[PDB]
């Protein structure tokens, strides 16, 4: 009902899945409903990059031109002359949500089809990568290309960052980058208490899709993995970040 109320207040559809890794208790609301994953996929893509290369291999430098730049290249647009290492691209993709960075990394791992294959290999039969940035954000209701579910995103995030899909030292890199994101101040971050560390990755897509996935660490004990996804039924609808922040407070209370 608290979730239903937010859906009424915000004129949107919410998809939530939260797992308290410490007790295995869960919070769910339309947990298996499909939504455009938008930039949240950047976290899963780095997870795959990491599995594929040693930490030392991340120092390989990638060269590119203005033709590789897309609609949003905050970091990437500043380094055309020299290129950037995979480590720098990973940083730009995750903390700045750099679109070109995502496309360059994607090309390194073999494209959306290879990403798909690697996720399947990890146990994710739901997430469906198909396109590059920025076209992946254009998803119509009913379509399954470039979509996932709250349940699948948390399972997959959890696998890479907390479990055995990656060795400790690589998990540490992913977590550090996510903990240091610069785009999620108004989402999950705003619905958690002070002193609670958060690692997140945001996204926005057509139909007012507004998403945030994260791991939350209370001062004491096991982390909480959470996905908050949302959409509206107008193609050019606008989103309201406050929805995410409020849904998060409901989750914390439901688990706390």
Token pair for 61: 């430098």
CA 166, CA 118: separation in Å to the nearest integer?
13
Residue tagged 């869960």 (tokens)? 26
Distance CA 113, CA 240 (A): 32
Q: Cα separations (Å) of 120 from 114, 117, 136, 192?
A: 10, 5, 19, 32
- Largest pairwise CA distance in the chain: 54
What tokens appear for 55 in the block? 């930490």
Which tokens is 120 given?
């399947």
**Mutual orientation of helices 99-109 and 86-96 as an angle, nearest 10°?**
130
Annotated binding site: 201-203
Q: Exposed, middle or buried: residue 26 (CB in 10 Å: 0-12, 13-18, 19+)?
A: middle
Q: Are 135 and 104 in contact (CB under 8 A)?
A: no
Q: Spell out the domains of the chain, with CATH numbers in brackets.
A: 1-256 (3.40.710.10)
The gap from C-alpha 75 to its chain's centroid, in whole angstroms, comes to: 19
Annotated binding site for substrate: 201-203
Which listed residue (77, 113, 135, 163) is catalytic? 135
Question: Is 135 a catalytic site residue?
Answer: yes
How far is Cα 88 from Cα 74, in angstroms, rounded to an integer?
13
This entry's atomic model was obtained through X-ray
- Spatial neighbors of 26 by CB under 8 A, at least 6 apart, are 17, 18, 19, 20
251 Cβ partners below 8 Å, 6+ apart? Answer: 16, 18, 27, 191, 226, 228
Q: How far apart are CA 103 and CA 112, in angstroms?
A: 10
3-state secondary structure 113-166: HHHHHHHHHCCCCCCCCCCCCCHHHCCCCCCCCCEEEHHHHHHHHHHHHCCCCC
Q: What is the resolution of this structure in A?
A: 2.0
The per-residue DSSP string of the chain comes to: -HHHHHHHHHTSEEEEEEEETTT--EEEESTT-EEE-GGGHHHHHHHHHHHHS-TGGGG-EE---GGG--S--TTGGG-TTT-EEHHHHHHHHHHH--HHHHHHHHHHHT-HHHHHHHHHHTT-SS------TTGGG---TT--TTEEEHHHHHHHHHHHHTSTTS-HHHHHHHHHHHHT-SS-TTTGGGGS-TT-EEEEEEEEETTTEEEEEEEEE-SSS--EEEEEEEE-SSTT----THHHHHHHHHHHHHH-
Active site residue 197: no
């Amino acid at each position: 009902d608290d979730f239903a109320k937010l859906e009424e207040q915000f004129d949107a559809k919410l998809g939530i899945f939260a797992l308290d890794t410490g007790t295995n208790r869960t919070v769910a609301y339309r947990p298996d409903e499909r939504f455009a994953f938008a930039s949240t996929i950047k976290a899963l893509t780095v997870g795959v990059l990491l599995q594929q290369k040693s930490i030392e291999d991340l120092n390989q430098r990638i060269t590119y031109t203005r033709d590789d730049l897309v609609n949003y290249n905050p970091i990437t647009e500043k380094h055309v002359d020299t290129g950037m290492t995979l480590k720098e691209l990973a940083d730009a993709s995750l903390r700045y949500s750099d679109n070109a960075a995502q496309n360059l990394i994607l090309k390194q791992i073999g494209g959306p089809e290879s990403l798909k294959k690697e996720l399947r290999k990890i146990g994710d039969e739901v997430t469906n990568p198909e396109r590059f940035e920025p076209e992946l954000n254009e998803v119509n209701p009913g379509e399954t290309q470039d979509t996932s579910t709250a349940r699948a995103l948390v399972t997959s995030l959890r696998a890479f960052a907390l479990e055995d899909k990656l060795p400790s030292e690589k998990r540490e890199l992913l977590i550090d980058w996510m903990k240091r994101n610069t785009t999620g101040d108004a989402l999950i971050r705003a619905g958690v208490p002070d002193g609670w560390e958060v690692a997140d990755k945001t996204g926005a897509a057509s139909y007012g899709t507004r998403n945030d996935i994260a791991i939350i660490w209370p001062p004491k004990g096991d982390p909480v993995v959470l996905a908050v996804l949302s959409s509206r039924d107008k193609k050019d609808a606008k989103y309201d970040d406050k929805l995410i922040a409020e849904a998060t407070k409901v989750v914390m209370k439901a688990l706390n």
